[PDB]
């Protein structure tokens, strides 16, 4: 129960099937090791068509 953060899925966040549990996105900005990260990463949104980096 007690943990530095971890909220009950509120505003954004991402679900996790690996262990059936929700988890915010404030714990995967460098260390990719969680199912909930797959939902947050990969940029959910997208431009109109495409851009030229």
From Swiss-Prot:
Originating species: Homo sapiens
Swiss-Prot/TrEMBL TNFR-Cys repeat ranges: 9-40
Subcellular localization(s) per the UniProt record: Membrane
Purpose: Receptor for TNFSF12/TWEAK. Weak inducer of apoptosis in some cell types. Promotes angiogenesis and the proliferation of endothelial cells. May modulate cellular adhesion to matrix proteins.
UniProt subunit comment: Associates with TRAF1 and TRAF2, and probably also with TRAF3.
Tissue localization of expression: Highly expressed in heart, placenta and kidney. Intermediate expression in lung, skeletal muscle and pancreas.
Entry superkingdom: Eukaryota
Swiss-Prot/TrEMBL induction comment: By FGF1 and phorbol ester.
Protein name: Tumor necrosis factor receptor superfamily member 12A
Gene: TNFRSF12A
Topological domains, Extracellular: 1-53
Intrachain disulfide bonds: 9-22, 25-40, 28-37
């Amino acid at each position: 129960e007690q943990a530095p953060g971890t909220a009950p899925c509120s505003r954004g966040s991402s679900w996790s099937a690996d262990l059936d549990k929700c988890m915010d996105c404030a714990s995967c900005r460098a260390r990719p090791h969680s199912d909930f990260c797959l939902g947050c990463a990969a940029a959910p949104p997208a431009p109109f068509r495409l851009l030229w980096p």
